[PDB]
Paper text:
[name] is an ADP-ribosyltransferase that resides within the vault ribonucleoprotein organelle. [name] is an ADP-ribosyltransferase that uses NAD+ as a substrate to synthesize ADP-ribose modifications on molecules. The [name]-homology region of [name] includes a BRCT fold, a WGR domain, and the catalytic (CAT) domain. However, PARP3 and [name] contain the catalytic triad H-Y-E but are considered MARylation enzymes, indicating that other structural features are important determinants of catalytic output.
The [name] catalytic domain was crystallized on its own, and in complex with the NAD+-mimic [name] (32). The CAT/[name] complex crystals diffracted to 2.95 Å and belong to space group P212121 with two molecules in the asymmetric unit. The refined structure has a crystallographic R/RFREE of 0.215/0.262. While building the model for the HD using the CAT/[name] diffraction data, it was clear that the HD occupied a significantly different position relative to the ART than that observed with [name]/2/3. In contrast to [name], the [name] HD is translated and rotated away from the ART active site, located in a position that does not appear to be an impediment to NAD+ binding. A notable difference between the [name] and [name] structures is that two helices αA and αB of [name] are merged into one continuous helix in [name] (referred to as αA/B in [name]). The presence of the continuous helix αA/B in [name] is likely to hold the HD at a specific distance from the ART, essentially maintaining the catalytic region in an open state. The analogous residues in [name] (V286 and I289) remain in the interior of the HD fold, suggesting that [name] is held in an open and active conformation without requiring the major unfolding event observed in [name]. The [name] catalytic domain crystal structure represents an ‘open’ conformation that is capable of binding substrate NAD+, based on the complex with the NAD+-mimic [name] and the binding analysis with the non-hydrolyzable NAD+ analog BAD. Our analysis indicates that [name] achieves the ‘open’ conformation while maintaining the core fold of the HD.
Author numbering: 242 to 361, 368 to 460, 469 to 568
Write the structure that this text describes.
């Protein structure tokens, strides 16, 4: 019948037995992300609507505007208690509402939006599609795995053993086409990050830090040629106990070598496309302990791989 042939097509169209490795990765990063929310949310995430988040974000803008104008804390707290009604927290309710809090509350709202959107087609594929990002497992047999393994395990100043469990080929669609390859000097660098950030990184790529009216080369996207340095930023997840790390092609064209720190950099110096923090050496002292590479454009970045690894300790 019409209906049978519909079901038979439905079976075909709705089928993708994508690998365990990729599935387990998706399940983890989402679980780890949800683990962050559950840590500081009285109300379950399922019982928060998208309206609550939109209104919550709307209040932060009013509170931020009011804070800069120097309104009394009476008004600020009155507005903020309305925010906390929509987005309940456990622990403290900061009396001193600084600008730094509002930025983190704004981040939190986005992490809530992720978890709400995804809830909806098995529960594994719903989470994969939600990333809008094409992860593909690379087999240990292939010569691509040995290649990438060595690429990661080259600049290792520290001699701490590294258990490279899984490697995944990753790509975002719009990230590739908008990449500034024409601007030369593209080299593959590493970006460490805690596991709870990964869903957000895969969803929206690496974003520019928000200049609050912390990094020692200003508000840009940092990378390193060394693995030992990227391990420091790639913290172990509470879910699995493993570390995740990105390999990105960073188009950084003209790269100015710096010795002194500079926290006020919103974009690259005039004349250069990027910055290199030169590390402390034998007879060349610097303020940088490790080699930092910083770009201040999202379209100077293009992530290639995700590396799942773990330290002994
Ligand atoms: N879309 C996104 N969703 C969620 N988190 C996202 C994101 N885009 C970036 N991030 C995350 O924001 C964080 C961020 O901006 N930060 C925190 C880190 N800080 C200093 C810094 O980058 N230092 C630094 C220096 C040298 C190497 C490396 C790093 C970090 N990773 C490295 O390999 C600069 C500001 C960062 O940890 C990144 O992973």
């Amino acid at each position: 019948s019409e209906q049978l042939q519909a079901l038979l097509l439905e079976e075909v169209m709705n089928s993708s037995t994508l690998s365990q490795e990729v599935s387990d990765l998706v399940e983890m990063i989402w679980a780890e992300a949800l683990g962050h929310l559950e840590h500081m949310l009285l109300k379950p995430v399922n019982r928060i609507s998208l309206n609550d988040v939109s209104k919550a974000e709307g209040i932060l803008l009013l509170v931020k505007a009011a804070l800069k104008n120097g309104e009394t804390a009476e008004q600020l707290q009155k507005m903020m208690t309305e925010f906390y009604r929509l987005i309940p927290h456990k622990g403290t309710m900061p009396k001193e509402v600084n600008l730094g809090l509002l930025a983190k509350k704004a981040d939190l709202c986005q992490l809530i939006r992720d978890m709400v959107n995804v809830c909806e087609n098995p529960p594994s594929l719903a989470k994969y599609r939600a990333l809008r990002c094409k992860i593909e497992h690379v087999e240990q047999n292939t010569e691509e795995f040995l290649r990438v393994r060595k690429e990661v395990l080259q600049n290792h100043h520290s001699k701490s053993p590294v258990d490279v469990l899984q490697i995944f080929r990753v790509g975002r669609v719009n990230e590739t086409t908008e990449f500034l390859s024409k601007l030369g000097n593209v080299r593959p660098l590493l970006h460490g990050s805690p596991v709870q950030n990964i869903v957000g990184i895969l969803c929206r790529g690496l974003l520019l830090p928000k200049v609050v009216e912390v990094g020692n080369l200003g508000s840009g996207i940092y990378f390193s040629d060394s693995l030992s340095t990227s391990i420091k930023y790639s913290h172990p997840g509470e879910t699995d106990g493993t570390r995740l790390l990105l390999i990105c092609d960073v188009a950084l064209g003209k790269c100015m070598d710096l010795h002194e720190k500079d926290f006020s950099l919103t974009e690259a110096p005039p004349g250069y496309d990027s910055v290199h923090g030169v590390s402390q050496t034998a007879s060349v002292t610097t303020d940088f302990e490790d080699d930092e590479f910083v770009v201040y454009k999202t379209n100077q970045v293009k992530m290639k791989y995700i590396i799942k690894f773990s330290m002994p300790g």
